[PDB]
Amino acid sequence: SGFRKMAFPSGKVEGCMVQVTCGTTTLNGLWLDDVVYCPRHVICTSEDMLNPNYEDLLIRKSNHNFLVQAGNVQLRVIGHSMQNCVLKLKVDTANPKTPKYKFVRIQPGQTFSVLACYNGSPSGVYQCAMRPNFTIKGSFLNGSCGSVGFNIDYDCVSFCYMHHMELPTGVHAGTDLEGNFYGPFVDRQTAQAAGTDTTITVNVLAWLYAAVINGDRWFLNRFTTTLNDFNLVAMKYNYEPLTQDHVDILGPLSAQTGIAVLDMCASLKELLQNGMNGRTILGSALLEDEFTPFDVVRQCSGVTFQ
Amino acid sequence: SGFRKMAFPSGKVEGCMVQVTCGTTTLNGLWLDDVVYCPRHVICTSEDMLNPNYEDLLIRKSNHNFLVQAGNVQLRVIGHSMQNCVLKLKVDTANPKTPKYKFVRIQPGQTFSVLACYNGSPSGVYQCAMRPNFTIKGSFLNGSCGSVGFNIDYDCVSFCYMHHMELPTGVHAGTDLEGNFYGPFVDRQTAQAAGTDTTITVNVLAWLYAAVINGDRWFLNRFTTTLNDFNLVAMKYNYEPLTQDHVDILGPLSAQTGIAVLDMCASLKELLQNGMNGRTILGSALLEDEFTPFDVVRQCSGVTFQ
Ligand SMILES: *[C@H](F)C(=O)N(C[C@@H]1CCNC1=O)NC(=O)[C@H](CC(C)C)NC(=O)c1cc2c(F)cccc2[nH]1
Ligand SMILES: *[C@H](F)C(=O)N(C[C@@H]1CCNC1=O)NC(=O)[C@H](CC(C)C)NC(=O)c1cc2c(F)cccc2[nH]1
Ligand SMILES: [Cl-]
Ligand SMILES: [Cl-]
Ligand code: NI
Ligand code: NI
Ligand code: NI
Ligand code: NI
Ligand code: NI
């Protein structure tokens, strides 16, 4: 019982975090085998980031210019190469703490844990969703660049995010570990605007199923709705349209609780139209959209990681 | 920018989790140096658990009765003793991954990270506060017994909680690492009521400072208040009394934002009297009370752990 914003255990990722310094710029890198992955931003001076020619700037950089520190040990850089917005520093030592890992590009509406780091040391861990507008609502300060987002499945770390940018609205933007941004963002010292965001309907439904699993059932009503009638309400409240693919993904939670997906949609319609009337769901006064169906099953079934 | 429920990185604690089995009962243990700490519940069979005489049950146990597994390695138990509600199993091997550590008993309002575990393997990490009623709002399933709660200062892990019980309202009770329960609770199979809970006033004020640090300051009014006049209002909304110690603990945040503690108290007094009127603070429609003043500084200044 209980339902919390639950992060993956961070130890497998902690063992990969290093400090990268080039000239006056220090940020985080990810050390996997004999490669350190970091934001290519690290090579730039102030006047470089005007409209930086990374091909031209990197040609001028020595392996010797990169200072890479794994705790109290300097790692020697023996080669460098750029992949999109990520710099790959080849080092002379393979990280003995490298976990089984993959690089994955996640979809909007999926979640991941962030290990927020400064000077290659961890500050903390929290859960994030990739928003429909390809931002995340992170917690990041100066020097957080190169902090990563990840999921774990059994023993395998799937890295999905490397932190680069804060927008003026105070939300965050970054890349996958192939250095391709999520969304229409660039790695520049500029004020950049995100598209309009939307509420992740399938996740709100997942969280209402979590509430039912945890015995918070007051919002359940006797009403049912069609998918079309529900979507006419979704649109008005800036919720994403619920597809049959989403209904299919909620199958397992519907089967666990005995509440048909379109019956839960009727309860969500009532909450959108009428509000909560002073009540809370899983301790929240708002409808939560940063838990996936899989996040709910993970937490409610006690899935562990080896 | 941003403000998240942020846990400590869990790696140092992950390296201490083991499985303890006595007969048919399996739960989690904490392996520090050559001692494994676990709930004494592990020595109960069926129809021991409703009114166990733990002293009598432990007399009948041999060292070999305790199966302790650290991953796929079995640890040899060479002694056992009971301290309050915790079992101390002396093993013939010191844990090479033992961090610098202390055992501390925390006060209501203090927060900590929980590494929820099953069969000695971590499921996830989240933040909890010790509630005024000496419960915690965790996320725990069957077999979570012996999961621990902790803080990190620099490199020192302060363990403050070991999980034992779920209460009827779906909240949680457990002990310090000396085996003394927080609150009136006992390690027995019986429904045990938590006291009516209250709001942690010093933490709400800390979170209002986090809001101001993040440029969310709509709720700041042009008034001040005395500590007396504030408490007269607090006590009508099920808030904890604010003390001068609370005021001084909030001093650094007051210094950072230029808002005197008593001026912030006047803004909180107006939020209690008038409500939030559909407005949000740091993305919440409720006043959040599970961040301490140190939690806000750690997160907003990027404090790291080595
Ligand atoms: C890089 F080292 C780093 O840590 N960050 C993290 C930002 C800092 C504050 N909170 C964060 O998440 N990245 C940067 O500082 C970005 C560097 C670029 C070149 C990748 N810059 C920005 O995020 C940025 C610049 C800028 C601006 F010029 C105007 C408005 C907003 C803005 N954001
Ligand atoms: C012990 F191994 C363990 O994992 N748990 C964790 C509980 C399980 C469900 N969620 C949790 O947090 N502890 C127990 O199962 C407790 C064992 C005792 C004997 C120490 N029992 C309870 O937590 C319990 C028993 C009980 C009851 F009989 C009525 C109402 C509530 C209640 N909780
Ligand atoms: Cl006792
Ligand atoms: Cl106001
Ligand atoms: Ni439960
Ligand atoms: Ni040199
Ligand atoms: Ni900021
Ligand atoms: Ni004995
Ligand atoms: Ni044997």
Task: Give residues with Cβ within 8 angstroms of A52, minimum separation 6.
Answer: A44, A188
Pair of tokens at residue A39: 């934001």
**Residues contacting A120, CB < 8 A, separation 6+:** A17, A18, A19, A20, A28, A29, A69, A70, A71
Pairing mode of beta strands A172-175, B35-39: unpaired
Going by C-alpha positions, the residue among B299, B305, B301, B288 that lies closest to residue B109 is: B288
Taking phi first (over 0 means left), then psi (-120 to 50 degrees means alpha), and beta for anything else, what does residue A92 get? alpha
Instruction: Give the closest residue to A219 by CA, choosing from A289, A292, A288, A269.
Output: A269
Task: Answer yes or no: are the C-beta atoms of A214 and A3 closer than 8 Å.
Answer: yes
Is the separation of the CB atoms in A159 and B23 below 8 Å? no
Residues less than 5 Å from ion ligand 5, measured at CB: A 1
DSSP SS3 for A152: strand
Joined tokens for residue A24 = 């006056």
B interface test, pick of A19, A118, A139 with most B CB neighbours within 10 Å: A139
CA-CA distance, B146 to B29, in Å (whole number)? Answer: 6
Among candidates B96, B120, B139, which has minimal Cα distance to B29?
B120
β partners of residue A100: A156
Rg over CA atoms, chain B: 22
Residues of chain A contacting B118 with CB distance shorter than 8 Å: 302, 304
Given the CA of residue B143, which atom of ligand 2 is nearest to it? 4
Atom of ligand 1 nearest to the CA of A25: 2
Measured over the CA atoms of residue A45, residue A51, residue A56 and residue A59, the dihedral's sign is positive
List beta partners, residue B163. B174
Q: Which residues, including other chains, have CB under 8 Å from residue B30's CB and lie 6 or more apart?
A: B16, B17, B18, B36, B37, B38, B146, B148, B159, B162, B177
Interface size A-B, in CB pairs within 8 Å, comes to 164
Strands B111-118 and B148-153: antiparallel
Amino acid identity of residue B274, one-letter, is N
Q: What is the dihedral of CA B147, B29, A149, A16, to 10 degrees?
A: 150
Q: Which residue of A has its CA nearest to B11?
A: A11
If one counts every other C-beta atom within 10 angstroms of the C-beta of residue B152, the result is: 25
How many angstroms separate the alpha carbon of residue B57 from the centre of ligand 3?
14
Nearest to A304 among B122, B138, B166 (CB): B122
Question: What is the C-alpha separation between B80 and B285, in angstroms, rounded?
Answer: 50
Which resolution in angstroms does this entry have? 1.6
Cβ pair B26, B68 in contact under 8 A: no
Q: How far apart are CA B200 and CA B204, in angstroms?
A: 6
- For chain B, give percent helix, strand, coil, nearest 5: 25, 30, 45
Q: Whole-angstrom Cα distance, residue B125 to residue B122?
A: 8
Q: Nearest-CA neighbor of A114 among A4, A3, A17?
A: A17
**Which residues, by Cβ under 5 Å, contact ligand 3, an ion?**
B 84
Contacts 24+ apart (CB under 8 A), B23-27: B23/B65, B26/B119, B26/B143, B27/B143, B27/B144, B27/B145, B27/B146
- Give residues (CB < 6 A) around ligand 2: A 1; B 27, 41, 49, 140-145, 164-166, 168, 172, 187-191
A190 lines ligand 1 (CB under 6 A): yes
Q: For residues A150 and B268, what is the distance between their CA atoms, to the nearest angstrom?
A: 38
Rounded Cα gap, residues A211 and A300, in angstroms: 10
| Rg of chain A, C-alpha, whole Å | 22
Separation in Å, CA B152 to CA A248, B99, B115, B121, B159: 42, 10, 13, 20, 9
Q: Cβ separation of A2 and B138 shorter than 8 Å?
A: yes
What does the alpha-carbon distance between residue A23 and residue A42 come to, in Å, rounded to a whole number? 8
φ, ψ at A298 (rounded to 5°): -55, -55
- Amino acid A188 reads R
Residues of chain A contacting B138 with CB distance shorter than 8 Å: 2, 4
Please state, in angstroms and rounded to a whole number, the distance separating the CA atoms of residues B144 and B50: 19
A152 lines ligand 1 (CB under 6 A): no
Q: Which of A82, A269, A126, A150 is nearest to B126 (CA)?
A: A126
* Residues A135 and A198 sit within 8 Å (Cβ to Cβ): no
Is residue B239 helix, strand or coil? strand
Q: Which of A11, A12, A123 sits opposite B304 (nearest CB)?
A: A123
β partners of residue A83 = A86
* Contact yes or no for B286/A285 (Cβ under 8 A): yes
Q: For a substitution probing ligand 2, which of B44, B189, B190, B192 has the most ligand atoms within 8 Å of its CB?
A: B189
As for chain B, the residues directly before each break of C–N over 2.5 Å are none
**Tokens for A298?**
């993970």
Question: Ligand 6: distance of its center to the CA of A91 in Å?
Answer: 15
What are the residue numbers of the active site of B? Answer: 41, 145
A292 vs A203: CA distance, rounded Å: 5
What is the widest separation between alpha-carbon atoms in chain A? Answer: 69
Q: What separation in angstroms does the CA of B149 have from each of A9, B93, B109, B114, B219? A: 13, 24, 14, 4, 34
| CB-neighbour burial class of residue A81 (10 A; exposed 0-12, middle 13-18, buried 19+) | exposed
